[PDB]
Write a protein that binds this ligand. Sequence first.
Ligand SMILES: [Cu+]
Length: 154
Amino acid sequence: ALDTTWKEATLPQVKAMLQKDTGKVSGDTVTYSGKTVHVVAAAVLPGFPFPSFEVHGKKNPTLDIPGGATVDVTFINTNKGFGHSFDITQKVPPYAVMPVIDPIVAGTGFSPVPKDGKFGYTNFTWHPTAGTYYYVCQIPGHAATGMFGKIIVK
Ligand SMILES: [Cu+]
């Protein structure tokens, strides 16, 4: 039951999607507001550290989400040669090389690798209850080496 349905986007389409994250940045936190919020996350945008996620142009930021909101996540894999995933868990860091993160509350399978001048992306919806979550990549070693961030749902 992970989201394993992918579409393909050209680079100008990727840039257009990254700009549609509806959060507001303060330091290394992104704060969302409203009834429906749009999170747009990318795996290793050009020039950012490997391995990492970027959301609203920040590396692995803490996401602050209002209670009761509908969360629409768009995940784009921009990293040549790797098929990163985006998975939400309540299991905490530090993560092992093969992390134990079940149950996965929402998230993706492994993404397509970039090819033919295009990039794979997907959309999924999430209706969380209040608490702390983490977003992680499942490729062995990546979470252990820093590819994760925190989500606080009020
Ligand atoms: Cu990864």
